[PDB]
Design a binder for this molecule. Sequence first.
Ligand code: A1A70
Ligand code: CL
Length: 167
Amino acid sequence: VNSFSGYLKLTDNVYIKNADIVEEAKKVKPTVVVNAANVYLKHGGGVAGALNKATNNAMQVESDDYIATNGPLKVGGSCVLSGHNLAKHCLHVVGPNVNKGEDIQLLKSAYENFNQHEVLLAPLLSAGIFGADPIHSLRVCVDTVRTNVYLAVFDKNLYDKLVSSFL
Ligand SMILES: OC[C@@H]1COCCN1c1ncnc2[nH]ccc12
Ligand SMILES: [Cl-]
């Protein structure tokens, strides 16, 4: 039993809700929140910009030190950093950005990072400003993640379509 509330169950391990991931994290304080990161951990917009803003830019400061030490992530890769005031940890995961021409097959690799954590709060990878089809992203999530994932979808209209079209 966990403290996630109001989710629709899609499969044994995948749950979904129309919610602002920032507000969800602040309420639940999960062990792991997933950020929709880029390889430079530049948290300018989308989910990343919103999460970073909620940390008063502490996420960005920590991220800049991480990059200075380690260099950029790989598309499809991840790193674990602090969750600041939002969660114990933040798993920064880089899905392919279609508006950069990146290979959508890397979306499965991106979701595989979730399997290293027993329970996560997460957005749909490569959705929003990363330009992929969110219906496809949900399909890949369900077919790749085996640990317990709670998906927050900000847009109510998109949430209803993902549910109604879910196979
Ligand atoms: O689940 C990811 C969805 C779908 O594509 C990107 C937008 N999404 C968000 N969902 C929930 N909270 C959010 N805060 C900022 C963005 C955002
Ligand atoms: Cl977005």
